[PDB]
Amino acid sequence: SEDKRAKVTSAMQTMLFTMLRKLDNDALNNIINNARDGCVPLNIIPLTTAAKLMVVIPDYNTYKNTCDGTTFTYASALWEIQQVVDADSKIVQLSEISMDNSPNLAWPLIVTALRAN
């Protein structure tokens, strides 16, 4: 039943997201969608502003979609960006992230933020 445990896991996961999609919650729907595009949490999404959010940004297109100024839009909520680092774990300024300069950046980027609402 080694292969059977896999089928069960697969079946359970299909039902899981089907149930989630039925709930039709904006926050859940957002993180699911982002995850489908490769935009995923590095760590558990913080319950309180004490803990910090860390999210993987695969490409500039995702960044442009989810980031405006210092504001990061995720889980149908706003987040104040604390820091951004590249795939080399080197600090990246927000002003460095642009259409022109993105090929020189090391992707993916990791955004650190606190809940703004």
Partner: protein, 71 residues
């Protein structure tokens, strides 16, 4: 009605995590169980859905854990 659905889903979500051997991580599992518990005890959708976001994020944070085609 929507409340029973989200509570039912949270049980499934913890089970999916359990079969992914999250119990091997003591602190993370404790977080998941706590979130799962609070969702079941949740008296309003605002509290329930917020905890569900965090619980689901654990699953989505695990590389290769979920087939991307199911999303």
């Amino acid at each position: 009605s929507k409340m029973s659905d989200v509570k039912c889903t949270s049980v499934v979500l913890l089970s999916v995590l359990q079969q992914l051997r999250v119990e091997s991580s003591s602190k993370l599992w404790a977080q998941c169980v706590q979130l799962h518990n609070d969702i079941l005890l949740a008296k309003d959708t605002t509290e329930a859905f917020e905890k569900m976001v965090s619980l689901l994020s654990v699953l989505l944070s695990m590389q290769g854990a979920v087939d991307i085609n199911k999303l």
